[PDB]
Nucleic acid binder design. Sequence first.
RNA 1: GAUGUCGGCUCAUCACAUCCUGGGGCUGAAGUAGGUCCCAAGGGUAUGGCUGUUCGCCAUUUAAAGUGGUACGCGAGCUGGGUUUAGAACGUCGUGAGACAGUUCGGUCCCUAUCUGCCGUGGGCGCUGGAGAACUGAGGGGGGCUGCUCCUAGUACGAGAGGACCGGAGUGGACGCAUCACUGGUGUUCGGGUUGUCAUGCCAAUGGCACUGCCCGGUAGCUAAAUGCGGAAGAGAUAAGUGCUGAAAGCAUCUAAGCACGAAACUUGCCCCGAGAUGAGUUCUCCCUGACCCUUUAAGGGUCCUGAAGGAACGUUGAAGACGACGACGUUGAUAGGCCGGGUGUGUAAGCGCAGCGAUGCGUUGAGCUAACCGGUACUAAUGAACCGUGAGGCUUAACCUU
RNA 2: AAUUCCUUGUCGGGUAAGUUCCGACCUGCACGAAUGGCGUAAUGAUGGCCAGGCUGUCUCCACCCGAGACUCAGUGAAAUU
RNA 3: CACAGGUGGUCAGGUAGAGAAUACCAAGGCGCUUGAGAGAACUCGGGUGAAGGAACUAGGCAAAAUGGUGCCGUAACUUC
RNA 4: AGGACCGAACCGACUAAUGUUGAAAAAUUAGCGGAUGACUUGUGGCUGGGGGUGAAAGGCCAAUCAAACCGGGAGAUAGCU
Lengths: 114, 120, 209, 64, 123, 56
Amino acid sequence: SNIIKQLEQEQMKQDVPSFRPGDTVEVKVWVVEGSKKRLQAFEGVVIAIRNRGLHSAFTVRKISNGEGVERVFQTHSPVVDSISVKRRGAVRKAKLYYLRERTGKAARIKERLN
Amino acid sequence: MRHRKSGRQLNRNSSHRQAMFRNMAGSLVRHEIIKTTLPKAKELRRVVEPLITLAKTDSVANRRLAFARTRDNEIVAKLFNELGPRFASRAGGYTRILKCGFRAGDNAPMAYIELVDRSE
Amino acid sequence: MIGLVGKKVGMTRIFTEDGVSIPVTVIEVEANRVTQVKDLANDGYRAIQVTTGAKKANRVTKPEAGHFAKAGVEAGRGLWEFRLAEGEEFTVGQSISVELFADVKKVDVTGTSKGKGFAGTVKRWNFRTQDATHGNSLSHRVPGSIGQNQTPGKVFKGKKMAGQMGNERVTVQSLDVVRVDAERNLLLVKGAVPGATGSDLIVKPAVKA
Amino acid sequence: LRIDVYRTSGAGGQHVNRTESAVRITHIPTGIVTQCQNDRSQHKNKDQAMKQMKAKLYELEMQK
Amino acid sequence: MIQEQTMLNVADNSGARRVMCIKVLGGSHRRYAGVGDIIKITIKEAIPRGKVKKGDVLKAVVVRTKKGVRRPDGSVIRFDGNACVLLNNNSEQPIGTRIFGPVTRELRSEKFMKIISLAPEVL
Amino acid sequence: AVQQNKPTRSKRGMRRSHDALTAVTSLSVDKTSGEKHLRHHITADGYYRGRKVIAK
RNA sequence: GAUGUCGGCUCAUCACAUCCUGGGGCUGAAGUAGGUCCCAAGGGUAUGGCUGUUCGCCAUUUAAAGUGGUACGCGAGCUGGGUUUAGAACGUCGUGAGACAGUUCGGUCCCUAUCUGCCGUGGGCGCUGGAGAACUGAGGGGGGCUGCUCCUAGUACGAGAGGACCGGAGUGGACGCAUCACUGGUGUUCGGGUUGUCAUGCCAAUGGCACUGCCCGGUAGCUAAAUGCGGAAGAGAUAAGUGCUGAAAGCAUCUAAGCACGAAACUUGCCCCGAGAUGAGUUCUCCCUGACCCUUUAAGGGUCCUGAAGGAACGUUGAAGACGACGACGUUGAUAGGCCGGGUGUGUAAGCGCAGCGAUGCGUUGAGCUAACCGGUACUAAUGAACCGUGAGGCUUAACCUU
RNA sequence: AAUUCCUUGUCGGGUAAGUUCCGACCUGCACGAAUGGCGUAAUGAUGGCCAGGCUGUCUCCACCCGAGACUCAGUGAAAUU
RNA sequence: CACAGGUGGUCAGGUAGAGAAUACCAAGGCGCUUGAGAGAACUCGGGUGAAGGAACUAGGCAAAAUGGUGCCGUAACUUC
RNA sequence: AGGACCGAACCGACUAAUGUUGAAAAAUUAGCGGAUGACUUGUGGCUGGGGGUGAAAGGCCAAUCAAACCGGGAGAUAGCU
Ligand SMILES: [Mg+2]
Ligand SMILES: [Mg+2]
Ligand SMILES: [Mg+2]
Ligand SMILES: [Mg+2]
Ligand SMILES: [Mg+2]
Ligand SMILES: [Mg+2]
Ligand SMILES: [Mg+2]
Ligand SMILES: [Mg+2]
Ligand SMILES: [Mg+2]
Ligand SMILES: [Mg+2]
Ligand SMILES: [Mg+2]
Ligand SMILES: [Mg+2]
Ligand SMILES: [Mg+2]
Ligand SMILES: [Mg+2]
Ligand SMILES: [Mg+2]
Ligand SMILES: [Mg+2]
Ligand SMILES: [Mg+2]
Ligand SMILES: [Mg+2]
Ligand SMILES: [Mg+2]
Ligand SMILES: [Mg+2]
Ligand SMILES: [Mg+2]
Ligand SMILES: [Mg+2]
Ligand SMILES: [Mg+2]
Ligand SMILES: [Mg+2]
Ligand SMILES: [Mg+2]
Ligand SMILES: [Mg+2]
Ligand SMILES: [Mg+2]
Ligand SMILES: [Mg+2]
Ligand SMILES: [Mg+2]
Ligand SMILES: [Mg+2]
C-alpha cells in the first residue's frame, strides 16, 4: 500500500486550489475536436467532492438549454485544465444531491463571503 | 460474506449489543475484573479501552463524551480522577484477557477481563 | 516462455497525456530466486522452481531449510514451478528480476481467487431467481429442478449446483502490461487480477499472443 | 395444404389436455386459414376442417 | 441505459413530446442502450401541429441518459432524465431540424454528424 | 423426506466413528506450585504463569 | 391399502430428421439474393401484445428466431391461471333431483431426505523406515456464438437498377471468468439533521425508545448497471465434398496402389481440478546410527531406554471458512485488540466572549468526532512446557565396488 | 351478452401489436318480459378492462440488519421401515 | 402441553394528540425456562437500492406510494 | 335524522406471507370489512334426530352431519378384501 501511495504522490496534481462544496466554478476541459485539442468552459456548482488521493473527483451541476447536466471530473487528470472558482456557496453540507430535483430560485443557494 | 468485516455480532441486535457494551464497560470500570464469555470479553476491548484512552485526556468535552458510551456519573468520575493517574505512561494496553474455564450450564468459554493495574 | 511470481499490492489508475484512464494492477514482482532447474536427463521435463518473499530462520522447517541450503539462496513464502521454452538456460544459485518481462506486451495472470465461500446456485452459476412475489413459496433463490424424471434416473455429473466458489488458483488472460519497474520491484498491468491485497500471484507471459 | 395440430381449449381433466385433436389447415399460396376443435377425434376434424377449408377456397375463388 | 417500455423526452421539434421505446435495436437479446445507439420507438404524446403523429412507429437515437455516459478518462456525464432524437425508418437520419439540449462526444460519427452540427452544445 | 428401508446397526456404527470426541492431548502444568490445568485457561486457585492474579 | 393432470416459471439435458453460424454439390447460381440437396450438433437459437393456454396471430426484432426426446423432462423445486370437488348463475336438456368436450364468478398444492445420484467438502487408512516439499499428468471438466461497419473497391459482374469475392481492421450485442481503479449500489459498528417523548438534580449538553424513529450523507468490505479479460490465434487426424496421378476394363476411372486439402464435430493447443492414476509415478531435502532376554528360534513376543524429523492440539488469528479443512503468526513476535503519526466521511462540536427582546446568529475554528483504511509501535495477551509421533529400515533375484 | 357452438363473427375505438375490454351490427346454435324484461344515482374486501401515479413485481438482482438453518454444551422427537 | 389461541365486568396516572388511536414513560409488574458460538447457501421478518418503471404475472398478487388539520377548489351523471 | 361517514374497543374474516409431525386438529403477521344497529356480548331458558334450527351453505346441531353421539338388536350382512 505504501508503494502504491508513493506512486500516486508523484502522479498527483501539485496545482489544485482548495475548493469548497457549493462553489460556482468554471472548469476548463480539454475536449477533442477532429484531431486538435480544444478548451471548453463548463461553469456550474460543486455538488460533490470525492477525495481519494489520485482517484479524487468532483461533480459540477448546471442546467443547459433546459435540461440539468451533472458532470463528474477526475481532479488529477490532465484533461481538466483550470479550476476557476468565481463565487463560493454558503451551505452546511458536502454532497448536495438535493439540487438534482431543485430548479429555479430553489436551485440558487446563499453566497459564502467569509 | 464477512471479508474484513471486523466486529463479532454476538447474536444480539445492534442497539441491544451497544447497550450491553455500555453496561459491560461500566461494570468493568466498577469492579476492576469481570468474569465473562471470551468472545464477549474480546468485543468489550474495542469500546472500553478507547473510553479509557479518552479519559486519560482530562477535559470537560472529554467528560461529556464519556457521559455517552459509559453513561454513569460516578463511573466517568472514576475513569477521569482515579483511572487517569492509574494509566499515564502506557500506550494502549489497559485491558488484560485471562481465560479460566467454562460456564457449566451451557459450556461457554469463560474469560476474566480486567484492568492491567489490578494489584495496586 | 517462463512466468514470474508476484504479490498483489492492489489497484490504481494511470492518467495519460492523451487522456485515457488505465486501471493498472500494482504487483510486487520481487527478486524471484531459483531453487531448482528441472530437466530431461534425470528429472524428465524442462521446468523452473522459483521462490518469492521472506520467511523467518526460526519458523522455517528443517527439510525445507536443507533444500534451500542446497540451492544457495534465502527462503521465501512458498515455491512455484514454471514450464521452460526450448532455448532457455538458468543456474541453480540465481535470481530473476522483472527485466525478463520488459520485452512482452501481453501477460496471462494466474491467481488464487477471492473465496466466495458456499455460493448459492444464483451466485455460483449466475442463475435466474424464481419469482420474489406472485405466490412463490420459499423458493426465491433456489435451483428449482435439478434433473428430469424417471428416464435419466440420476442427476448428471458436473451439474450447476450450489457449493464452494472461489478460493481457487485461476487465470485471467491476455492482459496488457503498461509499465515495468525494476528499481522498486513492481509490475504494472492494465486490468484486474484474482485475489485480495497481499495475494501471491502467478504472472505468465502471453501463451495466447 | 398445410396441416397443423394442437390442443383443444377448455375442460376435460387429463384427456383433452393431452390430445392434439384440434386442427388448423392453411392454404400455402393464399394465406386463408381454417381451424376446427369440435369433435373428439383428430381424424374427423381434419376432414371436417378440410371440407370447411374447401368451402372457404370456393368462396375465395367465387369472390375473386 | 435505455430499454424497452422506457419513456423519453423529445429533443427535436418534429412534433412529439413523450416517446416510449419498444425495441432496443442492433443485436439479439439486446437490452441496454447508451448514447449514439438506435432504438425503435413509438410516439405517445404529440404536439397538435407536427410532422410526426401519435401512435407512429419509428427508429430513434439516444441523446441523453440519466444513468450517465463515460469518457475514456473515467469521467461520467449524467443528465436530468432521458432524451432522444427521432429518425426516419429508411434513410436513418433525423426527422426534426431544431434540437434542444446538449449532446455527447460518443454520439459523433458518419450518420449523426448532421445531428451534431444542428445541436447547439456538445459534451 | 423419510427412510424407505431400515438402515443397519453396522451403518449407524460406521456413521458414529467421526461423531466420537477428541480427547484433550495433555494437561497444562503451573511451574511454581505444580497445579494441573487446562491449556491457556487459569488454575483452580487463580495462578497463571507462576503468578496469582485472581483471588477467586 | 393413490402413477398428481395443461400451461407458465427455474433448471435443463440428450437427439439429429440443422433454424443460424460453418463446409460443400447443384442450380432455371451475371451479382447480391436465393432455392434445393449432401455433410455437420461446438455453440447460439428474441422481447412483447391478446389468450390460462401450448399453438397460433400480430408488433417489432435477430446471424437465426430448429423440429423433437427426456412421465409430450422437471409440483418430496415454485405457481395453480386452465383443469378434476364441495357455492352460485346463464343458456340449454330434463316432469324433477340434477346434468352438458357449453359458458361464467368463487374456491386449503403436505413432506426436517435414510439410500442412490449429484454439488461441494473433510476425516481415517493406503501407496511398504519415517517425514516435509516440489511437481508430472492417467483422466475429467470449463470454455468453444456471433453480428454490424470500414479498408481492399463502387472495383472481379453488370443494358441498367444496382452491387458482388476471398483477407484484415475496427467494433458491438448476448454469455462466461476476474475484479473494485473508475461510475455507482449498499453500508442498522461513522458523522450530521430533525419529530415525538422520556431519563441524566436543573440550564445546557447528552442518552434511550419509536421499522436504523424518520431521513441526508457516507469508511472498509461484498457487490453490478462498472471495467479488464476471454470465445482463442491457431495445430493435427477428418465428415459430405473436393481432388491428384492410375489398373482390372489398350478407353476409362477420388482408389483396388500412393498422395493432398475440407467445419465450430474429434486428438492436441487455452484455463482449472486432478497419482485413492491401488498401474498409487518422479525429484529435492531432512531426520531417527540403542543394549538385553523368553518360550515354539522368528517379517515371533517383547523389556528397558530413547523421542528425532515432524505433527497435531491449543492460542492468536485470515480479504480461509457452515464445520472440519486451508493459510499466517506463538515473544527472536506486528498474530490479534487497542495506542501513536497519517489518510477518509461529516460540515465551524462543546466550553468561552460578542450582538440581538429573544429565537438565533457572530467570532472563536474546516472546528471537534470518525468502523473494518495505511504506516509505525510489543501496551496486554498469545509463556516456560507437556502429548502423538519413534528408533538407520523387510524377502527374492540380478547389473557391479573386486567385470 | 354471466347466455353465440360456428368464432379470436364483422366493422369501429382503445394498443407498436388487444382471443380480454368498450361501442355497434344481428346470422338470438339456444335472450326476453315478475323461475321478470329493460334502464338506473349511490353502494360493493364484487367481476372484467383502461389511464395516471407509484414502486425491486420485472429487466437483474445487489448489499445490509435481524430469527433460524451451521458448530459446542444440554435434553430429546417423529412419520417410515 | 407451563399450548403465540379462546374468556365477561370494574379502575383509566404524564406530555403530545380530536382520540381508551399511536407514541415514549408513572404506578405496578415483567425479560416471554435452553443456552453458548460463529456469522455459508437457503428459508423466514425486514431496510435500502443506479437506470428504467409493469417490460412481471393468469391478474400490479405482493410491495411501493397515497395519507393529517385549516383554506381554496371540484366534472359527467343523479332518485337532487 | 340516519340499517349516514371516517375510525379505536368490540365483531368479523377479503388478501397475501408464514405455519402445514404447526405456537395452534384453522392460528399468527401485516394489511382488510362492519362498527347505533337486520349491532355485539354476558348470564339464564327452550327447541332433539327423519327430528331441531337454518338472511338456505345441505349449513349448524359438543374438533363427527345428505340425517348427531351412545348402548342394544348384533358375532347384521359382505357372491367382496
Ligand atoms: Mg441463537
Ligand atoms: Mg424471472
Ligand atoms: Mg400459496
Ligand atoms: Mg404454503
Ligand atoms: Mg416467501
Ligand atoms: Mg418430482
Ligand atoms: Mg437407471
Ligand atoms: Mg447426419
Ligand atoms: Mg409435464
Ligand atoms: Mg406442473
Ligand atoms: Mg383455479
Ligand atoms: Mg409444494
Ligand atoms: Mg378489434
Ligand atoms: Mg359488446
Ligand atoms: Mg331467463
Ligand atoms: Mg307474462
Ligand atoms: Mg314467467
Ligand atoms: Mg396492459
Ligand atoms: Mg429502482
Ligand atoms: Mg414457558
Ligand atoms: Mg396502545
Ligand atoms: Mg431510482
Ligand atoms: Mg410476459
Ligand atoms: Mg404482459
Ligand atoms: Mg395490493
Ligand atoms: Mg354506520
Ligand atoms: Mg388481523
Ligand atoms: Mg361502507
Ligand atoms: Mg338413515
Ligand atoms: Mg362383522
